[PDB]
Scaffold this active site. Structure first.
Site, mmCIF file in Angstrom:
data_model
loop_
_atom_site.group_PDB
_atom_site.id
_atom_site.type_symbol
_atom_site.label_atom_id
_atom_site.label_comp_id
_atom_site.label_asym_id
_atom_site.label_seq_id
_atom_site.Cartn_x
_atom_site.Cartn_y
_atom_site.Cartn_z
ATOM 1 N N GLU E 59 41.174 46.108 28.285
ATOM 2 C CA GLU E 59 40.009 46.949 28.595
ATOM 3 C C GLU E 59 39.862 48.106 27.609
ATOM 4 O O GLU E 59 38.782 48.347 27.081
ATOM 5 C CB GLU E 59 40.126 47.501 30.028
ATOM 6 C CG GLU E 59 40.025 46.447 31.155
ATOM 7 C CD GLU E 59 41.222 45.478 31.244
ATOM 8 O OE1 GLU E 59 42.379 45.838 30.902
ATOM 9 O OE2 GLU E 59 40.986 44.334 31.666
ATOM 10 N N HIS E 128 39.292 44.822 42.845
ATOM 11 C CA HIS E 128 38.108 44.153 42.369
ATOM 12 C C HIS E 128 36.863 44.869 42.883
ATOM 13 O O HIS E 128 35.889 45.020 42.139
ATOM 14 C CB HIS E 128 38.117 42.700 42.838
ATOM 15 C CG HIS E 128 39.022 41.816 42.043
ATOM 16 N ND1 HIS E 128 40.354 42.104 41.841
ATOM 17 C CD2 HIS E 128 38.790 40.647 41.404
ATOM 18 C CE1 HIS E 128 40.901 41.158 41.097
ATOM 19 N NE2 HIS E 128 39.974 40.257 40.826
#
Ligand SMILES: Cc1ncc(C[n+]2csc(CCOP(=O)(O)OP(=O)(O)O)c2C)c(N)n1
Ligand SMILES: Cc1ncc(C[n+]2csc(CCOP(=O)(O)OP(=O)(O)O)c2C)c(N)n1
Ligand SMILES: [Mg+2]
Ligand SMILES: [Mg+2]
Lengths: 340, 324, 40, 343, 324
Positions: E59, E128
């Site tokens: 990321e 999530h």
């Protein structure tokens, strides 16, 4: 003048050859490195791997039926997961990734609690005392820096145990993978770092992750050793984790172990069955017994999961802090009234 | 003893190292150096390199080190060199340590205190003085503590280190040696989640934290000369807020403003304002207004004095409320 | 101790009405706006 | 059954021996690796290094007097900073750390803007167009991942150019250091990564960072070439960077270069050995040295005055540079501060 | 054409790729695979591996890549696989990209759009579904956009991409394919920082964003059966706020609630309340109340239905306000 860059690349590659003991035919290709295991240890390892295969088949099934939630398949990785766990002791602390549920089951997490993890229930993460594991880690790489700290804490208390942790080929791209191995190496901490390389991270080839020709060489950046192992070979995987465990208790620091596997002839069960059968240590009826044992245990565990009472909001609030802050005190009351 | 805030912090930390063999202290340059601001001075000399140690230069690593250590019985007190460096440490603090008790159903826990300097008024380089308390205050399972005086600083830190869940202890650089104050010798504690009245008043409540408490007290003094009695509440803990103390005061005065050093879109002032609107609107004579920095990146060092909120903005805003 | 929404307290103040004096018809004693008008 | 662990650590470390062309006396101890520099290029490199030494002395002094703010000393790192820059072309993009001001000055940042950076004024970071640099980066490691993207940008546009970035020995411990080199490797991007190792990060020795015997070997984690060089040696630094540049612009990916330095042993000074090497060649004299010195002092004094004459920042200035078009909150605040300024 | 939200996003991404050769899309599994949610399905196949490409699993690196690409004159549209994974990449979004125009005094700028899915109601695994918009909304130099409809998603994304400063575009997972709506073919834009009324009303203002808009529309239909007329305001952009539309609605109705899926200590509801308090307190018949999740870590999957705020919570809090 030209810097010898190509030579450098070749020279480093030569330091990371694939370690293998059994070939696909179950024949011993490396006697010198064969680990010392009793005939019953050899049979137990096969029992657990066969058990794990069936656990995977049943879990896949159960998920499709809606009986389990999140599930990351493990079939094909039995040697890497099971034979690596086999080289450990109960004192050892495991920090699993999301797919490393089998290792913690065998380390003593009850099966039904593993299923409650999959479904998403707080009780599946209520590990028993004496069982040295964390719940599976969903954040990729977070377990690697945490393992460095566990290992450090082990070394500080003087204990003869290791921390061991697992990540996939994709996870080697994280910053935390690098920090985990570099902190442990800097502190000469007792940690084993396993990278399970199945060549794809979701849809992404390992070739898209890195130009490094092995993942094991990533150890070089930490100053620690790496071994690349045939991850479809239970004896090679056993011998590598056992050597790393020895190295770590002897205050020599951490090791990085890369296992090369395939998730679904190269099957770890295939070659190990042949290995054992050549020695009259395995038969169809012993194998069919483990299979039945598994199916029975899985069925029971699924029922014990089913009888776990539902979570309430108050439960969730209760486990946030030891002593609840004003806001959560207020909200406990609001949800207690709601639940009445 | 008359103490500076940095001294009161160092004293808190010696008292906990002596009382608790599990207390560890680590971070970049906290050992032999005694800390970039001397906050850990003498601690490694007295207590050993095995209780107070330097780490590699990696904030994320430090966070994960504290988690591992806490899984192994210790009571870690790591340090993040400046709070502007929390970005690289957010997963371990907010994604991990804040969540372990919840995540393990109480089987494991995180008796961690993260010490971090922040704050403006001393011409520091970029990303040294950023006020980032607003971010950590949004994370369930953390407590966030910001002392303004040497006395508060010492009690809150002993409490923070005793707390069996994660605490973020934020230390304002300007406040480190800006003022001297009589702080008790020996051990004492202040409860986390408890504000206090620093000046009693009846016309307007001024709620504040960090360097803005002094700016608020200094404003209260200039307001008294104008016949405006302002009550000054120092939050001390910004998550959880002390709702009783805040509400009691607004109920008494009927007027409020909230003062923070952070940009208007950041900090915890909007939280405070929402709480007051929700719990005491029937007492309100006027809108609860906010004093805050402009919604820009933290100023290039030379622009600090024109950019940072100070006593004069507090005065102007309070008067805006009085004249509503 | 009086209870009254800001719009009322302000409606009162600008019209020289002391709220503490005005009897409130709203819930739990709340001083309503048409009570300021009723007092006036 | 031992695994050959001890051998592995040694054999790998052996792939990273210190590259050196000039020893402390100005003697060529590696003539095959000798870079092709004209007489005039050798002088120019020396002029730049001398000037940079003066800049450090004057900056420390000005900082003491309160006429500069943030200043991270550079004396001793002249070969590493100046010789590496010398290997670059104007097409190349520099991503400096907080200490790498000299590199961006020599790439074309006006000196008074370097001083405005030190004081904390936005104009100091207003890089002239065509001067391909960023202001110095305060977040240790951030420049490494940004460079991987710059280099990929350059490759995608087919520009025969590189991105170069610098960090310290401490900064090799960051995740982003590793992510920068690994991304550049994965994309085969024209990036040169420099690690300047003076053995200390504030008070932390390299040995507390890592147990790796070199920092150059961290390249192995990315599968890219790594080089360890004497960072007190202008000719070695130049040669390694030129070789990394040529590999990059010819499309073979990034290189990691570790420079071994020391910040102010007096024998080790890059000026000392380079003065001897050039004097023994009759290309350097005391007059030339004192012309550079006095030029530096004049230009520095002019820069500091020009910085002094820059109008003071206002909050309205800081708001207007946030976005191209202001969001509602900032429109409001701009009016509030416009009135405040008005006054 | 009748489009789902994911189709309208794909359609916006397709339009921008054709329109601007500088646009680039990249992330974990966005190229050949077409995305974990098919959001970039067909894009690499139509436009090439040089426009739409995959990245290593990191990321942090993606953010940095986007920054460097922007320095080289590209218009990056990166993806972060789930927003719970933002902690990793906080420095580059908040510490770097949001600050570059300011930091360089306008010399460089960051025309970057970060697409990231978030949100609950589908039994996702850990980290999530978390709502972390509250974190990025506190950063100067960011704008934060959260559509609830196919039609809004397309016009807002085209706007987000053409914006020459960083924009976080948060895409709710439950809303990807939950319903269809007429969405014009070809290009149109919707202004960033601009709310709209999804249901006109006269008794109470319900301010919402993300999946809570549909929940507020559902609550509003139930309230109308009891003669309570709710005005549903969809914020669309959570930073900056459309102050004009929010205040105008509150001045008309005299009552207001703010609805979010995020925990009460998180999200952006406190900001909205504070803004109302500040600008329209004289219109208020009652305090501004908030619908929000309990202040716990995002729930274990099985617990979502009891934990997540829904239309019933909205109905209840709306009535609390009517009966104040
Ligand atoms: C920090 C983070 N980023 C992204 C994801 C989403 N994700 C889940 S599994 C996966 C693939 C990981 O591949 P690998 O490391 O090779 O392990 P494998 O799943 O193949 O066993 C990704 C990207 C995550 N869980 N955490
Ligand atoms: C991410 C981050 N962590 C910490 C700091 C504070 N800091 C500034 S310089 C420094 C020492 C860095 O040493 P090194 O990387 O070796 O480079 P050097 O200054 O010695 O050239 C530290 C910890 C920072 N600016 N950024
Ligand atoms: Mg994989
Ligand atoms: Mg250094």
């Amino acid at each position: 003048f030209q810097f010898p860059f190509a030579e450098q690349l070749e020279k480093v590659a030569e330091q990371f050859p694939t370690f293998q003991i059994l070939n696909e035919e179950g024949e011993v290709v490396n006697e010198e490195a064969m680990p010392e295991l009793s005939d019953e240890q050899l049979k137990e390892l096969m029992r657990r791997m066969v058990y794990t295969r069936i656990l995977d088949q049943r879990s896949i099934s159960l998920n499709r039926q809606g009986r389990l939630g999140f599930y990351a398949p493990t079939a094909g990785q039995e040697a890497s997961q099971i034979a690596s766990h086999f080289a450990l002791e109960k004192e050892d602390f495991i920090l699993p990734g999301y797919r490393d549920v089998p290792q913690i089951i065998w380390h003593g997490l009850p099966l039904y609690q593993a299923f409650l993890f999959s479904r998403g229930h707080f009780h599946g993460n209520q590990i028993p005392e004496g069982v040295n594991v964390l719940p599976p880690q969903i954040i990729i790489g977070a377990q690697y820096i945490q393992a460095a700290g566990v290992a450090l804490g082990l070394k500080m208390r003087g204990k003869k145990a290791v921390a061991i942790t697992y990540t996939g080929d994709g996870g080697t791209s994280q910053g935390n993978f690098y920090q985990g191995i570099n902190f442990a190496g800097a502190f000469k901490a007792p940690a084993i770092f396993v990278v399970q390389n199945n060549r794809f991270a979701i849809s992404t080839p390992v070739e898209k992750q890195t130009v490094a020709k092995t993942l094991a060489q990533k150890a070089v950046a930490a100053g620690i050793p790496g071994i690349q192992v045939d991850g479809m070979d239970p004896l090679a995987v056993y011998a590598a984790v056992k050597a790393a465990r020895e190295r770590a208790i002897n205050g020599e620091g951490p090791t990085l172990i890369e296992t090369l596997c395939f998730r679904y002839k190269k099957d770890p069960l295939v070659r190990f069955r042949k290995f054992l059968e050549a020695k009259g240590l395995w038969s169809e009826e012993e194998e069919n017994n483990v299979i039945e044992q598994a199916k029975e245990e899985i069925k029971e565990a699924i029922k014990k999961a089913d009888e776990t009472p539902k979570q309430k909001v108050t439960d969730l609030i209760s486990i946030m802090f030891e002593e609840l802050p004003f806001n959560l005190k207020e909200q406990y009351e609001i949800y207690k009234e709601k639940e009445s | 003893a008359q103490m500076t805030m940095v001294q009161a912090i160092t004293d808190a930390l010696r008292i906990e190292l002596k009382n608790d063999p599990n207390v560890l202290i680590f971070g970049e340059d906290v050992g032999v150096n005694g800390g970039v601001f001397r906050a850990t001075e003498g601690l490694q000399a007295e207590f050993g390199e095995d209780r107070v140690f330097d780490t590699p230069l990696a904030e994320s690593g430090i966070g994960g080190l504290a988690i591992g250590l806490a899984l192994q019985g210790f009571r870690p007190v790591p340090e993040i060199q400046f709070f502007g460096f929390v970005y690289e440490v957010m997963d371990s603090i907010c994604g991990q340590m804040a969540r372990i008790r919840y995540r393990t159903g109480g089987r494991y826990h995180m008796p961690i205190t993260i010490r971090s300097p922040f704050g403006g008024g001393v011409h520091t380089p970029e990303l040294h003085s950023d006020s980032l308390e607003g971010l950590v205050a949004q994370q369930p399972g953390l407590k966030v503590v910001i002392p303004s005086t040497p006395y508060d600083a010492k009690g809150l830190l002993i409490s923070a280190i005793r707390d069996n869940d994660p605490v973020i202890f934020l230390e304002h650089l300007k406040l480190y040696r800006s003022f001297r104050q009589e702080v008790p010798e020996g051990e004492y504690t202040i409860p986390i989640g408890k504000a206090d009245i620093k000046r009693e008043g009846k016309d307007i409540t001024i709620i504040a934290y960090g360097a803005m408490v002094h700016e608020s007290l200094k404003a209260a003094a200039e307001l008294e000369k104008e016949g405006i009695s302002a009550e000054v509440v120092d939050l001390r803990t910004v998550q959880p807020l002390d709702i009783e103390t805040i509400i009691g005061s607004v109920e008494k005065t009927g007027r409020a403003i909230v003062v923070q050093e952070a940009q208007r879109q950041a900090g915890i002032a909007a939280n405070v304002v929402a709480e007051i609107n929700e719990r005491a609107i029937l007492s309100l004579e006027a809108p609860v207004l906010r004093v805050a920095a402009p919604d820009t990146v933290y100023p290039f060092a030379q622009a600090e004095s024109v950019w940072l909120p100070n006593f004069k903005d507090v005065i102007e805003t309070a008067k805006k409320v009085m004249n509503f | 101790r009086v209870i009254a929404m800001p719009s009322v307290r302000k409606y009162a103040r600008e019209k020289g009405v002391d709220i503490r004096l005005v009897q409130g018809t709203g819930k739990n004693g709340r001083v309503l706006k048409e009570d300021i008008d009723a007092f006036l």
